[PDB]
Amino acid sequence: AEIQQINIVGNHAFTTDELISHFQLRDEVDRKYQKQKLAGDLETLRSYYLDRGYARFNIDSTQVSLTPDKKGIYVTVNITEGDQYKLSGVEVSGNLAGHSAEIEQLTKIEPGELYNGTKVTKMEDDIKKLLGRYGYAYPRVQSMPEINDADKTVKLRVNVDAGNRFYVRKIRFEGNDTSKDAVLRREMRQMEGAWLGSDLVDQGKERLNRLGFFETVDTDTQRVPGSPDQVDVVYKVKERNTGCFNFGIGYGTESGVSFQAGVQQDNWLGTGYAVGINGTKNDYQTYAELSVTNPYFTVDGVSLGGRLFYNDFQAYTNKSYGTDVTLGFPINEYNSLRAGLGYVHNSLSNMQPQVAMWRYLYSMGEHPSTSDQDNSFKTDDFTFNYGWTYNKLDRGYFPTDGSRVNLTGKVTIPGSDNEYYKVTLDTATYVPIDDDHKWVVLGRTRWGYGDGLGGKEMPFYENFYAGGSSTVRGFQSNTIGPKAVYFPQASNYDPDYDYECATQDGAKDLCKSDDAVGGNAMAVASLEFITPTPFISDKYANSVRTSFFWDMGTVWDTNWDSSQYSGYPDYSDPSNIRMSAGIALQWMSPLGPLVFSYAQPFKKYDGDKAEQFQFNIGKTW
């Protein structure tokens, strides 16, 4: 009962396969009773012919003929061809708005083009759209080609009626239950009590989608009953459950007493503030962090925010804390600037004797004794922070178009204990390759570099790390890059269970290790191919995304003394690029985002560690 073939009778300009290639019905890799596809194919065929100048094209009839015993279906269409017509020009008349120079310019064609029905439709939309920009809400545009058969040519008659102006009386919102009204009314570019334009109202949809709080934004321009020239623009939105309260406590005879808790919300009780509270404690490490951001301090877009943090760990011993405050503001529709100040204090003690750490220590005037763990250092740095951003993305959860650039960095203020600078750059681009935005090409890169001032090295605890589900998939987190080189003593670990090379007995020379130290510069890039979900219940169809990816990245150590350490791998060579590939799934669950991935590290080097099945809470993109 399946379709066996599609026959075309009377076609001479195109072959059977060329025309069938544009149908949704196909007899090869079958479908039955697809009435809607047959109708769509017949309309497609008509448009296909109209696009080539066949102004007289006509379909006389179609048949669908079932074979005996429901063995198959024959489909046939009867085609009458005409000829190709030239377009002589366009004559525009009617109640024009006084902007004939633009209406005429938008409709200009080059002499000798063939008639094209799609171009006529485009001309109509380019006239309704233009009039819709000055404030004519309901123009009437119609056209009719006059056919000159003797000269195989057409002339297009376009009739325009601008109608009248409309004004916006009230802008009302429906569907927001938690978000404060002052949030939605900061994003409308169309003001009440002024002329309507669609080029202004349509930006509200993009602005609200970029905010990222809502699942959908449905616009409307309902006309006011009993009034000739007024419209009520209404936005209907549905809020997503934005953030979460996470708490857990650990207890036992071997575990002791510990806890972890925090709260993260991008929208605090619906008032527009973003907050983050985190903290945890156990018997060897303490951490606390607080941050608050106000996206609107002033009505023009100035934003303020800042944070405080503290942590410490005891084994070496590492303690740190600090604060920062950032101010930012937009400079146009898509770009914005941030700048701010901060203070960081830290201390280290009982540092394990490593070459990478000590080269830095030497550069500051420190002189720890060789392989002597009896040591300390303190740092008090004042930092200036800055950043530039660009964001033209269409959505907050699963972008489909535009690009994003985030250029950030910081420099030491003179008088700080350390003297250095650090710059990073995230970029990402979405390119749709399908009109339904189900097939999308997604590229991402990360660049970074830091260095010191005055001949000093950058503090080692600011080094870059790479590898992990957030940066390069398939490697053990923070394992890509140079490893620590150990010196050959009087520790509390020497008796047993220690790192042999570091002990009094295990070694009398240098050795390589598996302990990542990161480095002064990094570059990472990845490509994902975003595809539609093979199958899922409709309920979750818009909450999941699947993709295939190919990742690469590299981290390398500037100022590596390859001459003094020639017996070991030279970490100054950037060419040792790590590469991986795999598949990933992203899901926006009722409890927040999750990312799952599987990757195989097909290209790896000495000391690399692999991890193939990974997932995390990305908080990225």
Partner: peptide, 25 residues
């Protein structure tokens, strides 16, 4: 290994013990 989901979009777990729960807003 005791756990519960007492309400939609609410999760609880009980399990030394490492009890935890989540609410999202």
């Amino acid at each position: 290994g005791l756990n519960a989901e007492i309400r939609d979009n609410v999760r609880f777990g009980l399990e030394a013990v490492n009890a935890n729960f989540r609410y999202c807003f």
